[PDB]
């Protein structure tokens, strides 16, 4: 029975006796493995012998020895050598470890063998020893009715056959099983599968099972066409809506795509869709006409600006140059954003006249934030300041071309040729300073309208402006080109714009090119490392300022352990405070996925001798923590407010206003201290000058859009990284160094409303869902689950963060579908009884239509 002497007798005759000798060894394999350790080379030497037929039983002996010796690698090889005795169905810790060890070595060779062939999982390219357990383990999990280990390991092992074959046998079409199964494939594969082409095929397989549309999930197919950006699958979804005609189902798909799509996909849904055929009812939806109406109509119904506390802020003084006029104008544009209220410019005369030449830019650009979402009369707002009507001065005239960029951003195809011809006329030269101001707003205006779309005409038009080496308009020329290069961009423009930075040494020019080189690389991840290396090796302050945001834009979304280590050493070794501030702000864009660990990371960096380090970690904390939970991030910002430094207090006040949105009414205790600081810091002369300027801006952020719109970045409504929201936060890092850039922040404000509308066209009626939520509805600035319904759950402020507890009542004219879908920027639920006394109220939406 003892294996040591029996393996030493293998050199004798009568191999028939050796068969009975190996049978008694199988009993002692789990008892004494020490004496067989010296006889191990005799087992492996006989495996390659063609005259040795006992390798089937010999493989079982060596499988339980090397494993007990502490070597997990040999346990996989000697077990599957026979491919017979191995039993995966037996319950023991011997097999389960070999399974986990084989999968651990299988996921490593899966990505390495992908370069040679993409069929490696269907072929013998991988040594079958690693594919034998991997195939039998998934089949064992399928028989056990467990999809957690089956789909999770399949995404790590890079095998498409598991997703396609196993999904067919697990079909349960109670109609609610196939929706969830695919949901785990979209979320996990982003943080697991490294290859972009492997995860691309996974999204294409789920389209075939959902193609017949048996009342299945229409949101899953929406995330497929947005991530793939394929014109074949996008237009195919609309062709299915033509066969099965539903006005409530085809609408919810159309309103969801236009919000979550990138700039390149919006052109496919409009320009490319028209050539191959479209739906006349669904064409205007993808063009943004009802979508822009949602921003204008929802915010206009309920808007409380609290003019009582607003007048005391802007009536204090007419001085302080443009620092005061910007704080009162930009914060005022927050509350009226989307509602198209000119009362600041029109109803209030004095605050406009006290502005200087450069201070009139914020007063004019405030209309772009207020009137944002107007695709028709938006030009009539700037009509007196448009070219050909002149103006009171050419300094304020330049701000009108910038206001068109904020309103028409992404829809500005109509304004593309309008803003381009103005630049071409002045592209030759300039004889005055205000002429560059006119082109300054034109370059930023054409950049926002064409933002996300590659345009060679705008790039060549702004390229000639850079040759003139303009101090004012030269900086906006680089910013306008970087917005057109977002996403993949042009590889040739990477080295061209980088060469002009070393050739032209201009303050605004080099800093403008540094941000332009950050925007040209978006989502490229390791593809942008060539430009990052050139900026880190250079000692220039402006090249290192934009090098951090280059990491923030490409490495955003799924977190990267390499991008965290890069931004960490930049804020330590480098002695530049502006670069240390830009490095800690860039870290928040990589951490957007996990908001729970952000306060712990910025608190470690919040202790230092530099003020810019504490200033950067303050705003970087509020980026991910704005639309999310974890109220404890305010306590991290508490010691930053007491900092005597001026710009640290201002960045702290803005960071508090982002996290504290909708946190009042017995949610957070810090909402009482922030409301007092509104008029306390402004009237107090002991505080900093820039501290009270940001406190007035922070007062308007919480009340922006009539205490409705909030800052949403990397949420469930968008589904991916918002391009307009991530760029507006980068522009905020530069405030008093040149002139306040805060006008770009209006792209991140979206309203929170829940309404059913109708099943055909736009209505916006008035009803009451009567569900359980905290009361934000009647809460405005003044002078547990209880299953308790509430008065008015329709639209207004509500509580979108905790809204998961809000149900939907079926007793009204509507019907539940998603059980509180919760998407604010889409809504339009299913109406089972259209054209009924739902108490319809006609809005102003016909003005923007």
């Amino acid at each position: 029975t003892t294996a040591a002497p029996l393996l030493a007798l293998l050199r004798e005759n009568q191999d028939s006796v050796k068969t009975y000798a190996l049978e008694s060894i199988n009993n002692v394999v789990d008892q004494l493995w020490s004496e067989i350790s010296n006889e191990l080379p005799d087992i492996e030497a006989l495996y390659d012998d063609d005259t040795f037929s006992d390798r089937e039983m010999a493989a079982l002996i060596a499988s339980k020895v090397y494993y007990n010796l502490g070597e997990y690698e040999s346990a996989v090889k000697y077990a599957l050598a026979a491919k017979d005795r191995f039993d995966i169905d037996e319950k023991s810790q011997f097999v389960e470890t070999i399974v986990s060890k084989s999968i651990e070595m299988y996921v490593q060779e899966a990505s390495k063998q992908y370069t040679k062939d993409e069929q490696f999982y269907t072929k013998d390219i991988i040594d079958p020893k690693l594919t034998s357990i991997f195939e039998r383990m998934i089949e064992k999990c399928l028989k056990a009715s467990e999809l957690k280990l089956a789909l999770g390991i399949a995404l790590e092992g890079y095998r498409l056959d598991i997703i396609e074959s196993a999904l067919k046998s697990k079909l349960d079409q109670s109609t609610s099983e196939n929706v969830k199964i695919i949901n785990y494939l979209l979320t996990l594969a982003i943080t697991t599968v490294t290859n972009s082409k492997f995860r691309s095929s996974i999204l294409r397989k789920s389209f075939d099972f959902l193609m017949n549309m048996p009342n299945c999930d229409y949101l899953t197919l929406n995330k497929v066409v947005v991530n793939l950006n394929d014109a074949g699958l996008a237009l195919q979804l609309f062709k299915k809506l033509k066969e099965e005609n539903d006005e409530g189902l085809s609408a919810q798909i159309a309103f969801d795509l236009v919000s979550s799509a990138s700039q390149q996909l919006l052109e496919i849904l409009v320009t490319e869709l028209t050539a191959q055929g479209y739906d006349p009812a669904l064409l205007n939806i993808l063009s943004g006409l009802p979508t822009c109406d949602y921003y204008n109509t929802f915010l206009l119904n309920n808007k409380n600006i609290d003019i009582g506390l607003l007048n005391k802020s802007k009536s204090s003084l007419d001085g302080k140059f443009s620092l005061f006029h910007t704080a009162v104008s930009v914060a005022n544009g927050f509350m009226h954003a989307g509602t198209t209220d000119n009362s600041f410019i029109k109803a209030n005369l004095p605050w406009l006249g006290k502005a200087q030449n450069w201070a009139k830019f914020t007063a004019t650009a405030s209309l772009g934030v207020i009137h944002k979402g107007n695709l028709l009369e938006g030009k009539k707002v700037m009509a007196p300041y448009l070219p050909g009507s002149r103006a009171s001065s050419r300094f304020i005239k330049g701000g009108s071309l910038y206001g068109l960029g904020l309103i028409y951003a992404g829809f500005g195809r109509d304004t593309t040729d309008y803003l381009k011809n103005i630049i071409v006329e002045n592209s030759g030269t300039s004889g005055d300073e205000d002429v560059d101001v006119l082109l300054h707003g034109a370059s930023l205006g054409i950049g926002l309208a064409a933002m996300g779309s590659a345009n060679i005409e705008v790039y060549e038009a702004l390229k000639e402006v850079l040759y003139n080496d303009s101090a004012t308009s030269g900086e906006a020329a680089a910013l306008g080109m970087g917005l057109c290069m977002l996403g993949t961009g042009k590889p040739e423009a990477i080295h061209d714009m980088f060469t002009y930075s070393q050739e032209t040494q201009h303050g605004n020019i080099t800093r403008g090119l540094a941000v332009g080189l950050a925007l040209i690389n978006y989502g490229r991840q390791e593809l942008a490392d060539d430009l990052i290396t050139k900026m880190l090796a250079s000692d220039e302050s402006l090249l290192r300022y934009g090098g951090a945001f280059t990491i923030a834009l490409a490495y955003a979304g799924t977190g990267n352990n390499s991008a965290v280590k890069r931004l960490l050493h930049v804020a330590v070794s480098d002695s530049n405070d502006d670069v240390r501030r830009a490095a800690v702000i860039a870290l928040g864009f990589v951490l957007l996925r996990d908001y729970t660990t952000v306060p712990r990371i910025v608190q470690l960096l919040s202790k230092s001798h530099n003020a810019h380090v504490r200033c950067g970690t303050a705003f970087a904390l509020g980026i991910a923590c704005a639309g999310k939970g974890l109220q404890s991030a305010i306590d991290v910002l508490d010691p930053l407010t007491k900092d005597p430094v001026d710009f640290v207090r201002q960045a702290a006040m803005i960071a508090l206003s982002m996290i504290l949105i909708q946190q009042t009414e017995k949610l957070n205790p810090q909402v009482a201290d922030i409301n007092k600081n509104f008029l306390s810091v402004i009237t107090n002369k002991h505080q900093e000058g820039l501290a009270k300027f940001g406190a007035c801006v922070a007062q308007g952020i919480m009340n922006a859009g009539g205490r409705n719109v909030t800052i949403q970045l990397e949420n469930a409504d968008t589904g991916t990284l918002d391009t307009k929201s991530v760029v507006g936060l980068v522009m905020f890092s530069q405030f008093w160094y040149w002139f306040p850039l805060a006008h770009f922040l209006s792209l991140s404000f979206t309203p929170t409303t829940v309404i059913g509308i109708r099943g055909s066209d736009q209505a916006i009626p008035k009803f009451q869902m009567n569900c359980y939520a905290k009361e934000d509805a009647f809460s405005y600035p003044r002078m547990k689950y209880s299953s308790k319904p509430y008065k008015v759950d329709n639209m207004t402020r509500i509580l979108p963060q905790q809204s998961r507890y809000i149900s939907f009542i079926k007793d009204d004219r509507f019907v539940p579908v998603r059980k509180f879908k919760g998407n604010n920027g889409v809504v339009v639920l299913r109406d089972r009884e259209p054209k009924e006394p739902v108490a319809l109220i006609e809005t102003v939406r016909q003005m923007k239509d």
Partner: protein
């Protein structure tokens, strides 16, 4: 399935804090340099 997601979120703290230990040591060398200059 939340058990797998809660774990991966904790490695973000372990990622930065490994190289942040030596950053304090290099900062301590700069603090000792400034300490000799203040005397």
């Amino acid at each position: 399935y939340f058990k797998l997601k809660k774990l991966e979120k904790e490695y973000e703290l372990l990622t930065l804090q490994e190289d942040y230990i030596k950053d304090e040591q290099r900062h301590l060398k700069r603090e000792l340099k400034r300490a000799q200059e203040e005397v």
